[PDB]
Amino acid sequence: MVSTRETVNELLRRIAAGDPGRIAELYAEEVSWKLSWPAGDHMGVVPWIQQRSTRAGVEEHFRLIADHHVAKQSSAEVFSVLVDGADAVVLGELRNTAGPTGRSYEAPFALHLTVENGLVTRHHVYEDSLAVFRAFA
Template sequence: MMNATRETVAELLGRMAKGDHDGAAELFAEEIDWQLDWPEGEHPATPWIRRRTGRGDVAGHFRMLEEYHVPELNGTSVARILVDGPDAVVLGHIRQTVRANGRAYTSPFALHLTVEDGLITRYHIYEDSLTVARAHRPIPETDISE
């Protein structure tokens, strides 16, 4: 079981790294336990951080991440993958650059996945969402009047 979990996680990370959004979504079950959202719903600066319920919604999540960031400047790295039966935890650092304002940001992350029958049924990501939201704020116009 641990090998199957590790293989599924490695396949997910590989597809995500290639920008294969539909391929990544194929690894998810029809219904998933998703945790990457704000307590009060959506934050206007980070619309991809919201509740999702299944495979049909996952590709959209990854597409939105790409839409709001510069993929060529993505420096996200994985430091460790821990596997215990159907559960895996991926530890690393997110390094992205915001497309709209050019701001770069980093955040440590932990991703808890559960794999059942070869499909991901849990996707819980823990990151510094406040840093992410702050990076996506518009850059204020400066007053250049004399």
């Protein structure tokens, strides 16, 4: 068995490296995936904001979010990683540049993860959706 913290550290490494197939390898086949965003299509400006429940869906998310950002001006700064049993919360800030508009933005985020059998089963993002939306609108 691998600790929750080690599993979370590996996920954060793979997310920062960016490859969607390699990130999704860390998720269970079925994933509880939630984003602190309203439902709908948001006039098309944030296409990765959709409902997901599968490893294949997770791979699609990380593909889309990469395609919509300038890779060399985008990153997530992690301030702390809290771990309690099988759960963890990653606290940080998105420092990204939106591809279509060129606007840089900062968005605080908390990422709540659950791990079982070394795989991520839950990935719930709480982030400044207003700031992200404004950067792409």
